[PDB]
């Protein structure tokens, strides 16, 4: 029944009292008397100790030490001594610990996971490297396209030489070169109609990032609603990084839920058919990173993925993030009544 | 004087009228008729045409047309045909969407020298983005060897690289992706305020390193005594962070805005600190840091972190910036 202060907690005299912990969990306590007692209690836990073995070394009243202990424990500033077991994924461990999770356990869930990356352009490139190096067991690369030179902007795993080769091929080569303890596989396919979706295997989650055709997302959705298959969308609209929704069968809203005359209508169609995204690495990467963060959480099960029932957008030309509601609707034409 | 519609514009029927543009420029138009008129004039520029011409082309009232033209030109949905000319091709629509001549922006970048003071997580990511975007010369600064525990964030390193010098590998991997760029390495680690002098002069310094702790305070004060621009980037566990971007005589910096018993425990506990790394957070901070460098050097748009330290949460939907503009009462400026 040992507890130990996590190495990720930093304290700091601030304002009247002080700060405890860093990041999203940072707590500000105004009462100097209390803040100081928390510091004294935490100090007693630097070495794996039990509640009592720690109180004995404390020079404060058992009542206070107790309130300080409760503080530290709920915010996960102190965690079970067992959660501290040189590994290649050692870095990620502190992260999981900070969320009250068991590193080992989490890592275990990732290893037994199978993830599918649909469309290996800019998004699937970054998502796959994050997932691969984080410990995802199997990755299925689904893309029947070829590397060009103009692709060397957001596709971080490619070198010019690779030009002419298959994306799915180069990614695997590059993924294994970074983590040989996982398995990668390719599927020469390109979702053209709705029928092609049957060609994609079953898996913990599907990362859908390719943007073609216009209503590709809509078929992946439709299909996945009936296939009870979890999936997450990612991409961008020019300068806006976008990720989500993260669809989960029976516990979340689907893409369609919360959803031009004669000559003008043809003009609309011609201008759009003429559309080509204004790609930009920074935007592509923000979208990929946050998408991957959500896939690791959804699978690791230690914190709530952000894009559950939401389509999130992060701007690049202004400090702004905004999410569109996509919660379950009983009145849905895809998975409703 | 020819004008051409951008490929990055999109349109759709929505609510009462429609949407024109995608991304931050996306504007909703109420008047269904004004919408329809906007697409009608935009239609005359799928293929390049001058003002006068399009006018004698589209059958819309010279009044309504003029309005639609200016609208499209001001939002940059329509640009000078000359701006529509390559390796950095996919980046041209981005600069075009901000009303800049991609070739000129692509040129400012080619003539820039960027220094990456820290080749770990942020360094790796910032470094590959600048290189593949065209930053002409990049100075990689550091004195550490690749480890196994690093393959988690340093997207450039492989298992077969473990042990080698970071700058050595980052440099190889960069030239491998953009063979027309000039990279270089300097085996150095800032251990004291006197180490900074050993760091070259450049358009901007990407301060990624986070050791010692008070390295950013050191750099702030030094960069002011060298009139050197720098942008800090990193993370506070699960919160990505980038900025401020310091620009001599234009913005502010990291300086503007005794009970011995406890202070002991405090120091002892803080010395055991270890950051709670997470690649997603790392990547976001680096992506945005790089977007700011590319903008600062390309002048086509305002960097987001000018006078500001931005934070992007990861366990919560939230972005927040701590303003810190110029200030007189400072220990550096």
């Amino acid at each position: 029944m040992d507890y130990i202060l996590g190495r990720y907690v930093k304290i700091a005299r601030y304002g009247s009292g002080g700060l405890v912990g860093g990041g999203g969990k940072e707590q500000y306590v105004e009462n100097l008397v209390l803040w100081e007692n928390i510091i004294k209690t935490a100090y007693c836990f630097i070495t794996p100790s039990s509640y009592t073995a720690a109180l004995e070394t404390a020079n404060i009243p058992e009542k206070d030490f107790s309130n300080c202990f409760r503080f530290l424990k709920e915010n996960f500033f102190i965690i079970p001594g067992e959660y501290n077991n040189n590994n290649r994924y050692s870095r990620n461990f502190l992260h999981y610990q900070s969320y009250g999770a068991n590193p080992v356990l989490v890592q275990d869930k990732l290893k037994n996971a199978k993830v599918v990356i649909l469309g290996c352009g800019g998004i699937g490139n970054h998502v796959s490297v994050i997932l691969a190096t984080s410990g995802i067991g199997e990755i299925i690369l689904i893309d029947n396209d070829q590397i060009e030179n103009t692709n060397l902007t957001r596709q971080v795993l490619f070198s010019e030489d690779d030009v002419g080769k298959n994306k799915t091929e180069v990614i695997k080569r590059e993924l294994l070169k970074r983590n040989s303890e996982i398995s990668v596989s390719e599927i020469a396919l390109n979702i053209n109609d709705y029928t092609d979706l049957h060609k994609v295997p079953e898996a913990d989650i599907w990362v859908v990032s390719a943007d073609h055709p216009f209503n590709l997302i809509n078929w992946v959705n439709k299909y996945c609603v009936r296939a009870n298959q979890p999936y997450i969308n990612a991409g961008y609209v020019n300068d806006i990084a976008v990720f989500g929704p993260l669809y989960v069968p029976g516990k979340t809203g689907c893409y369609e839920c919360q959803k031009e005359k004669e000559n003008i209508d043809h003009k609309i169609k011609l201008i759009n058919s003429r559309f080509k995204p204004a790609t930009f690495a920074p935007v592509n990467n923000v979208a990929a990173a946050l998408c991957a963060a959500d896939v690791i959480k959804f699978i690791g099960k230690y914190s709530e993925p952000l894009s559950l029932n939401k389509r999130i957008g992060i701007w690049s030309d202004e400090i702004k993030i905004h999410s569109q509601n996509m919660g379950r609707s009983p009145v849905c034409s895809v998975c409703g009544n | 004087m020819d004008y051409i519609l951008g490929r990055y514009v999109k349109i759709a029927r929505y609510g009462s009228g429609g949407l024109v543009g995608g991304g931050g420029k996306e504007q909703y138009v109420e008047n269904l008729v004004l919408w329809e008129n906007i697409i009608k004039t935009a239609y005359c520029f799928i293929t390049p045409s001058s003002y006068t011409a399009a006018l004698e082309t589209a059958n819309i009232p010279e009044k309504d047309f003029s309005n639609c033209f200016r609208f499209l030109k001001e939002n940059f949905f329509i640009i000078p045909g000359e701006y529509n000319n390559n390796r950095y091709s996919r980046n041209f629509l981005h600069y075009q969407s901000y009303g800049a001549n991609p070739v000129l922006v692509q040129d400012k970048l080619k003539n820039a020298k960027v220094v990456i003071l820290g080749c770990g997580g942020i360094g790796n990511h910032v470094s590959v983005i600048l290189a593949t975007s065209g930053i002409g010369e990049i100075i990689l600064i550091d004195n550490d060897q690749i480890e196994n525990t690093n393959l988690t964030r340093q997207v450039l390193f492989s298992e077969d690289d473990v042990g080698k010098n970071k700058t050595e590998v980052i440099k190889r991997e960069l030239l491998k992706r953009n063979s027309e760029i000039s990279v270089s390495e300097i085996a150095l680690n800032i251990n004291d305020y006197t180490d900074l002098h050993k760091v070259p002069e450049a358009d901007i310094w990407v301060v990624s390193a986070d050791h010692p702790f008070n390295l950013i305070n050191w750099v702030n004060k030094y960069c002011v005594r060298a009139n050197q621009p720098y942008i800090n980037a990193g993370y506070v566990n699960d919160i990505a962070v980038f900025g401020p971007l310091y620009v001599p005589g234009k913005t502010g910096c990291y300086e503007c805005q005794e009970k011995e018993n406890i202070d002991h425990k405090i120091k002892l506990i803080n010395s055991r600190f270890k950051p709670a790394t997470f690649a997603p957070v790392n990547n976001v901070a680096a992506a945005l840091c790089a977007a700011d460098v590319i903008k600062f050097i390309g002048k086509y748009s305002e960097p987001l972190s000018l006078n500001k330290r931005i934070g992007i949460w990861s366990d919560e939907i939230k972005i927040h910036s701590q303003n810190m503009g110029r200030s007189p009462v400072c220990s550096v400026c």
Binding site: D211, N233, I240, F243, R311 | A12
Partner: peptide
């Protein structure tokens, strides 16, 4: 933010 990803 009102179109494809």
């Amino acid at each position: 933010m009102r179109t494809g990803n």
